[PDB]
Amino acid sequence: AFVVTDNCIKCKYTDCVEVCPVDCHYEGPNFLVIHPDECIDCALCEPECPAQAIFSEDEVPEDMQEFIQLNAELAEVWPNITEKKDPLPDAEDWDGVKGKLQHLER
Ligand code: SF4
Numbered sequence: 001a002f003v004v005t006d007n008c009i010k011c012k013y014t015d016c017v018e019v020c021p022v023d024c025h026y027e028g029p030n031f032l033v034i035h036p037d038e039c040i041d042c043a044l045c046e047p048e049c050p051a052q053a054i055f056s057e058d059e060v061p062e063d064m065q066e067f068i069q070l071n072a073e074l075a076e077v078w079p080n081i082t083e084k085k086d087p088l089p090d091a092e093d094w095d096g097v098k099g100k101l102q103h104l105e106r
């Protein structure tokens with residue numbers, strides 16, 4: 001499965017949903033996750049993320065391992081998103097800021 005990590009929070013460009021062939025993304029107020037069981041590992045969404053926040057599970061940085069289980073957990077309770085939307089209001093301000101997990105909204 002592929003996993004959405006920290007830099008997506010407060011950015012949520014959603015440029016990753018249009019190329020997904022199986023619509024396995026689920027959205028929160030300021031973050032998006034990939035459902036591990038529905039994801040077919042096509043890797044097509046990874047280069048589409050301006051925040052470079054997507055990684056295949058085996059490539060998730062050591063300091064962001066928590067996002068693997070987090071994607072699995074939130075994909076179970078959040079609504080499905082299959083269409084591209086406008087990025088969050090101040091996405092550019094937050095793109096690159098570290099430790100944004102502290103700002104994650106349920
Ligand atoms: S790797 Fe492919 S199937 Fe998985 S979330 Fe990305 S675009 Fe969708």
Ligand code: F3S
Pocket residue numbers: 004007008009011012013014015016017031032048049050051052053054
């Ligand atoms: S910022 Fe998030 S919404 Fe998709 S394009 Fe990147 S994983």
